[PDB]
Amino acid sequence: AMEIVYDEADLRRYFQTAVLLDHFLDDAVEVDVDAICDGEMVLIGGIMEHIEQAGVHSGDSACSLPAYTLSQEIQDVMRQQVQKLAFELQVRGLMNVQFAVKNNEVYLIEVNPRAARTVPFVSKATGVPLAKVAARVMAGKSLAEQGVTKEVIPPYYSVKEVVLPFNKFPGVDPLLGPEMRSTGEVMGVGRTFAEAFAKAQLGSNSTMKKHGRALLSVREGDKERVVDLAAKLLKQGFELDATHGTAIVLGEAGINPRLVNKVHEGRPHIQDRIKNGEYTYIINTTSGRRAIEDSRVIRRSALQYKVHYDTTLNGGFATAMALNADATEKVISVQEMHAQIK
Amino acid sequence: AMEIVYDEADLRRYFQTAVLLDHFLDDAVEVDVDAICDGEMVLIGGIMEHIEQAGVHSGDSACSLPAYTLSQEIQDVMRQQVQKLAFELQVRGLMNVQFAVKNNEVYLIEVNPRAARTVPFVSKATGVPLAKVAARVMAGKSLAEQGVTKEVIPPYYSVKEVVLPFNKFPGVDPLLGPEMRSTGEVMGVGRTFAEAFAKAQLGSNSTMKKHGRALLSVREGDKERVVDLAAKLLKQGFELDATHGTAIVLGEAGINPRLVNKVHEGRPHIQDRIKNGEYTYIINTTSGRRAIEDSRVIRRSALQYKVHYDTTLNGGFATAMALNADATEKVISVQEMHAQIK
Ligand SMILES: Nc1ncnc2c1ncn2[C@@H]1O[C@H](COP(=O)(O)OP(=O)(O)O)[C@@H](O)[C@H]1O
Ligand SMILES: Nc1ncnc2c1ncn2[C@@H]1O[C@H](COP(=O)(O)OP(=O)(O)O)[C@@H](O)[C@H]1O
Ligand SMILES: NCCC[C@H](N)C(=O)O
Ligand SMILES: NCCC[C@H](N)C(=O)O
Ligand SMILES: [Cl-]
Ligand SMILES: [K+]
Ligand SMILES: [K+]
Ligand SMILES: [K+]
Ligand SMILES: [K+]
Ligand SMILES: [Mn+2]
Ligand SMILES: [Mn+2]
């Protein structure tokens, strides 16, 4: 298990239902780092920046190699910490290090001193067979002896997206969190981030469309960045609907979405609107046990009626960017990809 | 003392703070008819169609001479009805009748076998000193004898608007009802109902503007018709704001107003905006002792801030028609007016 308590009252509440305690790094970028240590040196296999923020398990987060928003400066910091950790822990073969970047500061989430699930994706994206290398290291052949001593940074973007099994258990609230529920993943290769993400989104079987009406229903903390996402959808040709508070926020910024009723507010409401095929896209972010349990019907209908939905603002942005790409425009083979690697 | 009750609950509730019970003719057109009978015949002095529906006391209703929406067919029955009354009642001199028109049916409200407060208006509009005629009649000189026998229909529209003393008494909810509160009245003469109403409106000291932002917040029964008014305002160049329910309705119709918060909903709310002179027009309609008490702050606020406001949808429609006209375009003397009559 894993849960995120927001306030004192939430604490006891949880406790009632319910021990390590940890400050939840809100509004942080999650990063994964795969590396090999031979006792002599440390090789960075790959720095992957997650699309979904810290708080959504990495196994359920889409990610990019290379990072699409992290500064080189901060990545360099993560690279140095990985090395510090590698040598100190006595790693010999693979390791994976997870961070959270909040306010230009690097925080450590955890160290997995072994092969991590991102190893295949990184190998594919970079042309380096990490498990083959780390296995030789473990058996006794150094990285220097193998001629694998420099971190590779591909000339293209590699985006990994996941597939979740919620459709198999419709009674479950289809939302992301600190616990992993995904079964698999796909990879998208693009000239740009938008291009890789688009191919990854499509590969994951997304029903995302390039037109239609979008439903925006976000949490307080997102209300501010929503405006921009709303502008983006607008410039794309989407029409918009929104719930009360979200509408309030848009209006104030000059955006007037068409108001939609909350299930308790009356009719018609979102469920009806979703059930009746009015939307081609949904962005609904929530925060707090109670608020979640309450918004459960949005997510559930969206999944039922096959409407593409994002449950993170970060995901919404990414989806928005891909709107600008065409995943069927161009294709590349793995051999070509690896040949482009200088 | 007169009040309107809506349900069982409502009735006792009254009874508490609290006898004739009368069906309430909801969504009906109120009409006033002034006439003279001499036992021999009946002369129709004037048929005035109120702008505010039945439920808004005659003395506080703006009215039109001649009717501005009413059918000839309907007028004729009223006309017939009056007569019948004039005789049965044995009326000799002046009389006034008030009808209500629901679903093309004419209901009888009250008959006043004397001179009504409308007489001077009618007299000025039509050119006939109803007062003297009736006087001559009362003193033995028949309509026939006098040479006044056929109902006069003017060639221009005459609109009567009233003035309320609410500003002298602020603790008062400046809202209309079955009880008269006005002190005086003004007259507007025009080629079109719109032009007459525009003059009457200006004449009544209205602060209505020809631009800015409107605030719409109407009751359920009105929610339907409001769309058309919204559209009209829209055509005139106004920007719109609406409270939730109203914003929904509008949206369902293609109109996305800017969503605003009621007072208990958040900040800023309507009071805040009114207070900041955010609006140039407000349309607020309400049903229920509760909805009314609850909306009180809207009206007091508007009154206090000098924003023109309508408390009836019919009123709003008229305000809107008037936006088409220009009260200062043409001036006409009473002498001239009377000269045009055939
Ligand atoms: N302090 C924290 N702040 C923010 N997010 C965190 C924090 N600790 C854990 N998480 C989130 O929870 C997920 C799982 O935590 P982790 O320690 O890596 O568990 P696991 O062993 O299942 O991999 C992370 O991938 C991350 O999104
Ligand atoms: N049955 C009714 N249905 C709807 N409105 C009514 C009804 N009876 C009266 N009214 C409204 O209340 C007002 C007052 O009624 P009325 O009997 O004419 O009172 P008053 O003696 O003050 O002139 C009317 O001018 C009208 O707007
Ligand atoms: N990478 C996780 C899958 C994203 C899913 N559309 C969601 O936003 O919940
Ligand atoms: N004819 C009565 C005055 C109208 C006022 N604006 C109101 O609608 O309450
Ligand atoms: Cl299930
Ligand atoms: K994450
Ligand atoms: K772990
Ligand atoms: K009336
Ligand atoms: K009376
Ligand atoms: Mn982990
Ligand atoms: Mn009356």
UniProtKB/Swiss-Prot annotation, chains A, B:
Protein name per the record: Carbamoyl phosphate synthase large chain
Residues that hold Mg(2+) 3 according to the record: Q98, E110
Self-association state and partner proteins as the record states: Composed of two chains; the small (or glutamine) chain promotes the hydrolysis of glutamine to ammonia, which is used by the large (or ammonia) chain to synthesize carbamoyl phosphate. Tetramer of heterodimers (alpha,beta)4.
UniProt free text on domains: The large subunit is composed of 2 ATP-grasp domains that are involved in binding the 2 ATP molecules needed for carbamoyl phosphate synthesis. The N-terminal ATP-grasp domain (referred to as the carboxyphosphate synthetic component) catalyzes the ATP-dependent phosphorylation of hydrogencarbonate to carboxyphosphate and the subsequent nucleophilic attack by ammonia to form a carbamate intermediate.
Ranges for domain ATP-grasp: 1-139
Residues binding Mg(2+) 4: E110, N112
Gene name tied to this protein: carB
All copies of domain MGS-like, residue ranges: 206-342
